[PDB]
Amino acid sequence: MNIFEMLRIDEGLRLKIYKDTEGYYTIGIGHLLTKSPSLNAAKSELDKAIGRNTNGVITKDEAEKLFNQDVDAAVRGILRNAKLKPVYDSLDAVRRAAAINMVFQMGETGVAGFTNSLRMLQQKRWDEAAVNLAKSRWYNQTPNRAKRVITTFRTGTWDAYKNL
Ligand code: NA
Description:
Keywords: Antimicrobial, Bacteriolytic enzyme, Cytolysis, Glycosidase, Host cell lysis by virus, Host cytoplasm, Hydrolase, Viral release from host cell
Strand content: 5-15%
Shape: elongated
Helix content: 55-70%
Largest sheet: 3 strands, antiparallel
Strand order of the largest sheet: 1-2-3
GO molecular function: lysozyme activity
Oligomer: monomer
CATH class: Mainly Alpha
Order of helices and strands: HEEEHHHHHHHHH
Number of strands: 3
Subcellular location: Host cytoplasm
Number of helices: 10
Bound molecules: sodium ion
Pfam families: Phage_lysozyme
Radius of gyration: 16 Å
EC number: 3.2.1.17
Distance between the termini: 10 Å
CATH topology: Lysozyme
């Protein structure tokens, strides 16, 4: 297990434009296209991202290319964020994957607002952090995925992703 395999489990792989859990146009391995309700706007974003006129459909290689870029962007984002970087730096590599997963799903600004959770993580108060992380819109809206990510923060193991 690693961050790529983890997010592949959590996000799936779809080669045609679909709506994500929030109703937003997405493609590939959780590549958010736009929050606009316009499918045409989403198709434009896709074409811009891929560099060709798609039919709203991409190949697996293209999906994996966007995915690589998106994981890299999530990491880069954490490292540029004054609130997230110190917490991320304090973590072991397994818990760093859980951190990247959160940012991939909700964005840097959204995760940086988990102030109390972040403090508990930096303190290595894992059970307390896990309880706090679950008191969130995140957990309520995507409880199975959040439970997996939270278990990863709680334990520093890949146990929530084994059998998957
Ligand atoms: Na998804």
